[PDB]
Amino acid sequence: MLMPKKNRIAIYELLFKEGVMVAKKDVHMPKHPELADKNVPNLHVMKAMQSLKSRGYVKEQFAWRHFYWYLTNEGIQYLRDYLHLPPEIVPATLRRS
Amino acid sequence: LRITTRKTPCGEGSKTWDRFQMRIHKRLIDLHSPSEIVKQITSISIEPGVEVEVTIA
Amino acid sequence: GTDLVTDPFEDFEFNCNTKYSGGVTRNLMRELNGG
Amino acid sequence: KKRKKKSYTTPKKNKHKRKKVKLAVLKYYKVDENGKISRLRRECPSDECGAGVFMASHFDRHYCGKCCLTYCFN
Amino acid sequence: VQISKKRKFVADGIFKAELNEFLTRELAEDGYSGVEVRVTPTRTEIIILATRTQNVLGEKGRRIRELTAVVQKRFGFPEGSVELYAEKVATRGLCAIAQAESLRYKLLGGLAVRRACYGVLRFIMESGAKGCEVVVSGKLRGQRAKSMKFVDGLMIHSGDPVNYYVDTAVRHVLLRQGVLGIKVKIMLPWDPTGKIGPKKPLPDHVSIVEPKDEILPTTPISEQK
RNA sequence: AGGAGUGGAGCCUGCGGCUUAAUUUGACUCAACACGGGAAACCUCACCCGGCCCGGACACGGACAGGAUUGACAGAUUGAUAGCUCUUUCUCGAUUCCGUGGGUGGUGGUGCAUGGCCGUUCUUAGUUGGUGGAGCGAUUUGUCUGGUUAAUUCCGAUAACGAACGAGACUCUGGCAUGCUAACUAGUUACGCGACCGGUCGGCGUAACUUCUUAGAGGGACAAGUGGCGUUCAGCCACCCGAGAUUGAGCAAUAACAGGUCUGUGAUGCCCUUAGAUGUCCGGGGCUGCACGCGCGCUACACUGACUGGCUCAGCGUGUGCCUACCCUACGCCGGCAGGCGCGGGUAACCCGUUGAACCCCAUUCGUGAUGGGGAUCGGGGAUUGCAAUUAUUCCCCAUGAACGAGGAAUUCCCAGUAAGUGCGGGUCAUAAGCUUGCGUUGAUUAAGUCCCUGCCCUUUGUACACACCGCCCGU
């Protein structure tokens, strides 16, 4: 899998706090223009979220070398089924009426 | 702006090329007025595709 | 995945001269008058 | 279609698993049954790490792991 | 950030192409037709022309929100400096993108290929087109790949007028046996003003104004009030 | 009855079988062979002297505190500041350790499963319905005797009429405006100073709506005028007048190739490789050698062949701080100028730049010619500064002679600003070129024809061919 765990827990926390992102399709690249400055090296962070969304039970939308992920009900349902953290930590999805 | 490429995605066939071309036309108009009027006159709902820049000397 | 369907008409037009000429002819005849 | 064609040599290789001794003697050794184990030579008092920096001894030119530390008299 | 005019224009074109491709594959199921970008002082709007806007905006504008968020987060637009709208296209039957998508979804949705293509063709012509042509190439059953071509009406192939008079689109349909290509060409009708078709007429068409009528008897006797 | 440029006289690459290890994957007549934009030291290299890091959702065998992964030049591996000397063991202490598997997919196979794109048939004019005529029918007419055209382009004829593509029109591009639109970035100035014994004098001096330059709105060419030929039709030829009496190109029918591309692509169906997923490891001799076994190339023959930074001369374009800290360079470093050091300009009609070691020309000179006149391996003076260069980066010259003055059968390209000579940009890229793609500059000889060769198209004709003459077929 080529992944550590400490950065893994940190990236789960970051993914909780953000939820919806757009990512590039790289693996070993620690310099991504739009996903820097997370107090963690960007290689582990960016690959980590790619693997977080690419387990086999969450969809994607991708072309032109870029991953697009929108928070469907499958994202929230897998959040519940895997992390077992209820959404009362309010995400960025419950605004903009 | 010219870009000449090979037509084929493979390397087969007679050597035929595409000569793509981009033309960039640019104009300068210089005048003397207070900036309030230039802000008034820039707001003319310029059609898309025409980059407009206003600079002071 | 899915597969596109064929009317007996286009089936006959495609397989009029093939191993399946008899079958497509019979199915087209069944389409045109099969009551 | 073509590889480096490296298959004639080494048809089958045994696993490179090391049978390292479980009972550590080089790293930790007491043979005194005492809470206080010491070194007969003066210990390096550097404070950039803990007070119990573990250093092993060999014939010469020990490899430690971080910077290949060597017992020297400056 | 200072950048040369050539590089700026090329990067603008690249952004337009990437955005078009992304939201094409994102909402082609929603009858996507085209995208336009208006850059104005502090206002960078993205207009999405699509046949059906019910799912383009979704419910309570959720989908429009997600599209704006992903576009801003990918292309590095300042937060809230890009607002993308969605408006319908008045004539759906004169866009080859929309009609090629429609033919794809009629082929995928289950229909005889000749029936689906003839329905598309009929719709194109009642929409007012001067002519149309649909060519379907690929596995039409069997090992070999056949290509059918239904051309109804008139259409040009050569010269400059093809750029502004013939609008074409190519789509790939992924079937269980392979890929089927659908190519749709529509020759727009001449239309002065209104932008449904092209403005300038065909260069080989010479129109004649009718000279003023003259109906006078042997003796000029006019009707007056 | 024509020639010009010679694959052999002035710079290498692609491909086809073998030295233990090299002639490193698709494509093989036109329609493969500097083609895959394919100029590969790493990286996308994968015939490289030996290999290490990783692989796992679905059914799995060895069911967890070491079961060792990448950092020591010294007393070593056939290279290898990776540690495999049988050794080595504080740096996340869940990188998970060997097993054909659908893999957070493979530049793995199949282009005889496909899409898209491209090439070609085919650079030539060709192709098709509807209704009507002919035929039992396949089919045919329309789509033609003839003239004309580059053209199925027109005139005309006419059992066809009315149409649809292609050709043409069209788009870009040149060639012309003492007219228009007007420009503190290049180009004027006599209410001018930087001048004496009535000739305008360059960091600065720029209320002429501009001629040189830029680019737009238009103009302009139509076989329009005249003469001749021709059904006096379509047209053709010639000649004044004209900037010009068809400048380049681009686009481009119908029907097809089992044409090339699965190694351009999350464009793809089906099926399958290694546990070094072409996941990674600036780890690690894969070429570029010289029987022309082949193909593309690097290729001017004496006054004309060459030197007064010499008063002719370029134009097409490129150029930098979001992973471009690998941009274009002026000026001063003075071993003799590109140049390793400084200091500035330019995101550009602004700086390089009126384009930083220039052509053709010019008494270094040959009143003829193996000399001064042109480069025969091949050494230096300072080195553009590149993990190597040699096993492709890198810069003037001393006269020791190069078959030193038209070239085996076999052939390629070409009709005017063309061939050829000549250099300069762009792509590739680090300045990376003998490649290609463009641009200028010097600048012709031949021809205004033909169907002899090679082929194409329009008709008639023969056919025992239809896999269509690379056909069919006859006899021991």
UniProtKB/Swiss-Prot annotation, chain A:
Instruction: Share the record's PTM remark.
Output: Methylated by PRMT5. Methylation is necessary for its interaction with NPS1, its localization in the granular component (GC) region of the nucleolus, for the proper assembly of ribosomes, protein synthesis and optimal cell proliferation.
Q: Which cysteines are joined by disulfide bonds?
A: none
Where does it primarily localize?
cytoplasm
Q: What's the superkingdom here?
A: Eukaryota
For the modification Phosphotyrosine, the affected residues are Y12
Does the record carry Disulfide bond as a key word?
A: no
Give an example GO molecular function.
RNA binding
Q: Where does this polypeptide localize?
A: Cytoplasm; Nucleus, Nucleolus
GO CC aspect terms: cytoplasm; cytosol; cytosolic ribosome; cytosolic small ribosomal subunit; focal adhesion; membrane; nucleolus; nucleoplasm
For this entry, list what GO says about its biological process: cytoplasmic translation; translation
Enumerate the transmembrane spans.
none
UniProt keywords (A-Z) are: Cytoplasm, Diamond-Blackfan anemia, Isopeptide bond, Methylation, Nucleus, Phosphoprotein, Ribonucleoprotein, Ribosomal protein, Ubl conjugation
Q: Does the keyword Amino-acid biosynthesis apply?
A: no
Task: Please describe the quaternary structure of this protein.
Answer: Component of the small ribosomal subunit. The methylated form interacts with NPM1.
Family label? Belongs to the eukaryotic ribosomal protein eS10 family.
Annotated function:
Component of the 40S ribosomal subunit. The ribosome is a large ribonucleoprotein complex responsible for the synthesis of proteins in the cell.
Protein name (record): Small ribosomal subunit protein eS10
Curated annotation (Swiss-Prot), chain B:
What happens to this protein after translation, modification-wise?
Polyubiquitinated by ZNF598 via 'Lys-63'-linked ubiquitin chains when a ribosome has stalled, initiating the ribosome quality control (RQC) pathway to degrade the potentially detrimental aberrant nascent polypeptide. Deubiquitinated by OTUD3 and USP21, antagonizing ZNF598 activity. Ufmylated by UFL1.
- The superkingdom listed in its UniProt entry is Eukaryota
For the modification Phosphoserine, the affected residues are S33
PTM sites of type N6-acetyllysine: K15
Subcellular location, record wording: Cytoplasm
Transmembrane ranges? none
Question: What role is this protein assigned?
Answer: Component of the small ribosomal subunit. The ribosome is a large ribonucleoprotein complex responsible for the synthesis of proteins in the cell.
Quaternary organization: Component of the 40S small ribosomal subunit.
Family of this protein = Belongs to the universal ribosomal protein uS10 family.
Return the protein name. Small ribosomal subunit protein uS10
Lineage, opening ranks: Eukaryota, Metazoa, Chordata, Craniata, Vertebrata
Tell me the stretch of the parent sequence this chain holds.
61 to 117 of 119
UniProtKB/Swiss-Prot annotation, chain D:
Post-translational modification, as annotated: Monoubiquitinated at Lys-30 and Lys-36 by RNF25 in response to ribosome collisions (ribosome stalling): ubiquitination promotes subsequent activation of RNF14, leading to EEF1A1 ubiquitination and degradation and rescue of stalled ribosomes. Deubiquitination at Lys-36 by USP16 is required for maturation of the 40S ribosomal complex.
Task: List the residue ranges of the region (Disordered).
Answer: 1-18
Q: Where are the zinc fingers (C4-type)?
A: 44-67
Glycyl lysine isopeptide (Lys-Gly) (interchain with G-Cter in ubiquitin): where is this cross-link? Answer: K30, K36
**Subcellular location per the Swiss-Prot or TrEMBL entry:** Cytoplasm; Nucleus, Nucleolus
Residue numbers bearing the N6-acetyllysine modification? K27, K36
Subunit composition?
A: Part of the 40S ribosomal subunit. Part of the small subunit (SSU) processome, composed of more than 70 proteins and the RNA chaperone small nucleolar RNA (snoRNA) U3.
- Report the protein name in the record: Small ribosomal subunit protein eS31
Q: Which organism is it from?
A: Homo sapiens
Quick one: which gene encodes this?
Answer: RPS27A
Stretch of the intact protein here: 78 to 151 of 156
Curated annotation (Swiss-Prot), chain E:
| Membrane topology of the entry | Peripheral membrane protein
**GO MF:** class I DNA-(apurinic or apyrimidinic site) endonuclease activity; damaged DNA binding; DNA binding; DNA endonuclease activity; DNA-(apurinic or apyrimidinic site) endonuclease activity; DNA-binding transcription factor binding; enzyme binding; Hsp70 protein binding
- Known outcome of mutating S33A: No effect on phosphorylation by PRKCD
Its cellular-component GO annotations read: cytoplasm; cytosol; cytosolic ribosome; cytosolic small ribosomal subunit; endoplasmic reticulum; extracellular exosome; focal adhesion; membrane
Q: What does the UniProt record tell us about how this protein is modified after translation?
A: Methylation by PRMT1 is required for import into the nucleolus and for ribosome assembly.
Q: What's the impact of mutating S147A? A: No effect on phosphorylation by PRKCD
Q: Where is this cross-link: Glycyl lysine isopeptide (Lys-Gly) (interchain with G-Cter in ubiquitin)?
A: K88, K200, K212
- A biological-process GO annotation: base-excision repair
User: What quaternary arrangement does the UniProt entry report?
Assistant: Component of the 40S small ribosomal subunit. Identified in a IGF2BP1-dependent mRNP granule complex containing untranslated mRNAs. Interacts with HNRPD. Interacts with PRMT1; the interaction methylates RPS3. Interacts with SUMO1; the interaction sumoylates RPS3. Interacts with UBC9. Interacts with CDK1; the interaction phosphorylates RPS3. Interacts with PRKCD; the interaction phosphorylates RPS3. Interacts with PKB/AKT; the interaction phosphorylates RPS3.
What's this protein's name?
Small ribosomal subunit protein uS3
Encoding gene (name) = RPS3
